[PDB]
Design a protein around this ligand. Structure first.
Ligand SMILES: Cc1ccc(-c2ccccc2N2CCCC2=O)cc1
Length: 186
């Protein structure tokens, strides 16, 4: 099936906890995969302007590890719950993708999660000003704008609203799309 096929593809790129004990400032993100209308989508946030870390930006749910977290996946899940109301029973963490090194002292670990079909986002306005889906296939043929660096523009056909997706978030979206959608019969 579509979902078993995605999970089987993703597991081949799992690095596990290989880089998880290194002495960095540690953050995790959740790359939430949602199946709608027979296709896979990624769930994105627009972060509140009030935040210190990446205000107003399109991002994945996530944040800084704290002492309560059993592991890096727990960080991602705790933060996704705080930001969009995603509960533990509503997500299956499938793998840990290659981490992102930044600022010389920080490691951001991405986890891909399969989201239950009855989940409905409840944006927490203290954390996020918006939550939106993008079909995974978009990232194979994105609308690119050069700001010099590459920015994606996605327009939601439901309402005509345009979102700018850039940096780490854009890079990870492309990675997940390649992993799941490459070399597929029609
Ligand atoms: C959810 C999340 C998780 C981590 C970070 C983050 C942390 C330390 C340095 C840079 C970071 N990043 C990544 C995307 C843009 C940005 O400012 C920001 C947001």
């Amino acid at each position: 099936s579509m979902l078993d096929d995605a999970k089987a593809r993703l597991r081949k790129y799992d690095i596990g906890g290989k880089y998880s004990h290194l002495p960095y400032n540690k953050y995790s993100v959740l790359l939430p995969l949602v199946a709608k209308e027979g296709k896979l989508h990624l769930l994105f946030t627009v972060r509140s302007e009030k935040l210190r870390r990446a205000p107003g930006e399109v991002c994945f749910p996530g944040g800084k590890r704290d002492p309560t977290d059993m592991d890096d996946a727990a960080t991602a899940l705790r933060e996704a719950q705080e930001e969009v109301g995603l509960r533990p029973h509503q997500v299956e963490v499938v793998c840990c993708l290659v981490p992102c090194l930044i600022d010389t002292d920080t490691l951001i670990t991405p986890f891909v999660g399969l989201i239950d079909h009855n989940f409905q986002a409840q944006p927490n306005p203290a954390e996020v000003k918006d939550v939106f889906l993008v079909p995974l296939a978009y990232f194979l043929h994105p609308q690119v704008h050069d700001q010099i660096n590459h920015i994606f523009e996605y327009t939601n056909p439901e309402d005509g609203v345009t979102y700018q997706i850039k940096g780490m978030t854009a890079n990870l979206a492309v990675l997940v799309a390649f992993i799941i959608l490459e070399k597929k019969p029609t």
